[PDB]
Structures are given as structure tokens and as C-alpha cells.
Enzyme design. Structure first.
Site, PDB file in Angstrom:
ATOM      1  CE  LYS A  36     -24.299 -18.790 -21.100  1.00 30.59           C
ATOM      2  NZ  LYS A  36     -25.476 -18.370 -20.094  1.00 30.59           N
TER       3      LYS A  36
ATOM      4  CG  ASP B  60     -24.758 -22.549 -22.982  1.00 35.92           C
ATOM      5  OD1 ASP B  60     -25.427 -21.524 -23.751  1.00 35.92           O
ATOM      6  OD2 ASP B  60     -25.193 -22.672 -21.797  1.00 35.92           O
TER       7      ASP B  60
ATOM      8  CG  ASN C  51     -20.627 -20.585 -20.566  1.00 31.70           C
ATOM      9  OD1 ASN C  51     -20.715 -20.791 -19.266  1.00 31.70           O
ATOM     10  ND2 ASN C  51     -21.311 -20.820 -21.301  1.00 31.70           N
TER      11      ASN C  51
ATOM     12  CG  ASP D 246     -21.788 -24.071 -18.287  1.00 31.86           C
ATOM     13  OD1 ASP D 246     -22.262 -25.123 -17.669  1.00 31.86           O
ATOM     14  OD2 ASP D 246     -22.532 -23.636 -19.252  1.00 31.86           O
TER      15      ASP D 246
ATOM     16  CB  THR E 169     -27.587 -18.645 -23.792  1.00 33.89           C
ATOM     17  OG1 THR E 169     -27.096 -19.268 -22.570  1.00 33.89           O
ATOM     18  CG2 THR E 169     -28.164 -17.316 -23.362  1.00 33.89           C
TER      19      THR E 169
END
Ligand SMILES: COc1ccc2nc(-c3ccn[nH]3)[nH]c2c1
Length: 281
Positions: A137, A135, A140, A153, A167
Site C-alpha cells: 500500500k 500488504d 508501505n 513492512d 489492508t
């Protein structure tokens, strides 16, 4: 070796909420004895148990413990009361990268190169340890006081031995076709982030989750004319449907040819953390 006696909520002056997850909330706290600012992640046990997220929390704690590199948020202590779990994290003073993307619009060639290199250097490490973010992004990727990245995260992180869908905008095609992630999921995510740094927006954008997924699998996206040519080539070698043909993966002979790409001609990989980050426009 004798480690310091467990920390307690009473050893801190809790302040503003920094973040709000579904299972957690991150609170800015000051250690009284030492005057230090930690980002304390507070997880409520009942809810974790109820929503069957124990292996998620375990993995998180375990993965953060395994990490020791400057581009990652560090875990300092863990303690627990009768109802909550506390994780003592490093506090990135300048918050999310998305803040800088949205605030300046889009990044220049120098900035895009420096932050892209920092993310590549970070993923080379993480992948070296056989860990997959799953994940990745701009929400993060955080920025410390120095303006260097700090990736966070790890709840969804997976440790490979020899599931979860992240996401929507950063989901790789294979995740929609076999429900399976590898090192290459993180490289597809990097492809998006780069497109986002140059053009100020993610590549695949639509009215709802369904249309986004439809765009991803069809590979329906296009570069603005105002896009650096060398960065464009890099993004095209990353946003490839065939997971085994992404520049940076083992089939493509790993991180050697990725770091070797013309878009990083001038980057000195060996000491990025010691380098002075460029001024954000
Ligand atoms: C600019 O203000 C902010 C806003 C949100 C933040 N989240 C963290 C964080 C999470 C884990 N470690 N650090 N630091 C932050 C600073």
C-alpha cells in the site's frame, strides 16, 4: 569473516517516533561513532510472545536479510536488550508516498509512469526471490532523499515453498474466497496503487470493511473521465477477478508482457535507480 561487535542502545541518540505499529514502533536514531541516521524498529518481546507473533518477527528479519536491491529498505544490524528487539533500518528522508498523493492531489502521466515502473521493477525482483509482500500500500512505499521508492513492512511477507489478510482497500478477491495469497495478490495491489496515483483515491471505497469486501468481489469500481487511457487499460488487466488472468503472473507468462504494456512505451527498465525522478507537480 569477522562482522562488527553487536550494536547497543547506548551507541545511539534516539529521537522522534516515525511510526507506530501494533507490535512495533519506529524511532529515528543517530549512531554516535558514525553520525549516521537509521530508522530503528523497536519490538517488545513480552508482547510479541503474548500475542503469538514470534514466526511473524522471525520471517520479517529473515526476508529483510534476503533483500539486496535499491527499491527496498535495507537491514543493517539487529541487537537486543533484556526486554526489546532492535532492527537497524535505512531511513527514507521523505516518508510515505501517500503523503505525496494527498499533498499534490493526484499524479500526472510522467509521474504515474515513473513511480509505477519503479514499483513493477521492485515486484519483479521480490517475486524473482519467491517472496510475496501480502500488504502492498502507499503507506508501505516510502520515498528516499533522492525521491526514489523504498518498500518496507515485511512482517506479513511470505516466502513460497514449492493465512493473513492485509489492508481492506487492497485485498484481492481470492483472499476473500479461499483465504489464499500468491504473486497475483501483489499484482492486484499494484492495480489499486495505479488507480490511486491517477485519481487521488483507492478504487474500492465504502463506509466499513464489510461494504469494501462486497465491492471487491463484485468488482464494483469506475474510472473518472480524467484518467489516462493507457493507464486505464493497464489497471483493467490487473483488477481482474480470475487470479490467473492478471497481467504479470506466470499463467500470463510473467513480467515480460507487463513491462511490455503500452503505458510503459518510453520506460527504460534496465536503469531506473540511476534515472532522475520527475518533479512532483
Ligand atoms: C518525512 O518523515 C518521515 C516520516 C515517516 C518515516 N518513516 C520512515 C522509515 C521507516 C522505515 N524506514 N524509514 N522514514 C520516515 C520519514
Amino acid at each position: 569473516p569477522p562482522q562488527p561487535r553487536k550494536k547497543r542502545p547506548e551507541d545511539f541518540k534516539f529521537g522522534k517516533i516515525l511510526g507506530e505499529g501494533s507490535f512495533s514502533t519506529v524511532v529515528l536514531a543517530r549512531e554516535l561513532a558514525t553520525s549516521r541516521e537509521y530508522a530503528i524498529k523497536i519490538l517488545e518481546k513480552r508482547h510479541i510472545i503474548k500475542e503469538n507473533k514470534v514466526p511473524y518477527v522471525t520471517r520479517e528479519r529473515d526476508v529483510m536479510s534476503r533483500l539486496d536491491h535499491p527499491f527496498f529498505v535495507k537491514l543493517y544490524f539487529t541487537f537486543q536488550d533484556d526486554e526489546k528487539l532492535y532492527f537497524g533500518l535505512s531511513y527514507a528522508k521523505n516518508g510515505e508516498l501517500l503523503k505525496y498523493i494527498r499533498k499534490i492531489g493526484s499524479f500526472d502521466e510522467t509521474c504515474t509512469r515513473f513511480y509505477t515502473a519503479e514499483i513493477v521493477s521492485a515486484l519483479e525482483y521480490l517475486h524473482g526471490k519467491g517472496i510475496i509482500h501480502r500488504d502492498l500500500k502507499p503507506e508501505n512505499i516510502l520515498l528516499n532523499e533522492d525521491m526514489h521508492i523504498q518498500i518496507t513492512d515485511f512482517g506479513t511477507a511470505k516466502v513460497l515453498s514449492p493465512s493473513f489478510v492485509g489492508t481492506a482497500q487492497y485485498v484481492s478477491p481470492e483472499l476473500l474466497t479461499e483465504k489464499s495469497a500468491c504473486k497475483s495478490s501483489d499484482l492486484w495491489a499494484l492495480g489499486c496503487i495505479i488507480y490511486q496515483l491517477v485519481a487521488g483515491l483507492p478504487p474500492f471505497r465504502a463506509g466499513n470493511e464489510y461494504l469494501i469486501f462486497q465491492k471487491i468481489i463484485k468488482l464494483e469500481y469506475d474510472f473518472p473521465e480524467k484518467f489516462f487511457p493507457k493507464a486505464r487499460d493497464l489497471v483493467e488487466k490487473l483488477l481482474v477477478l480470475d487470479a490467473t488472468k492478471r497481467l504479470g503472473c506466470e499463467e500470463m507468462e510473467g513480467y515480460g508482457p507487463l513491462k511490455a504494456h503500452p503505458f510503459f512505451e518510453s520506460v527504460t527498465w534496465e536503469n531506473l535507480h540511476q534515472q532522475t525522478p520527475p518533479k512532483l507537480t
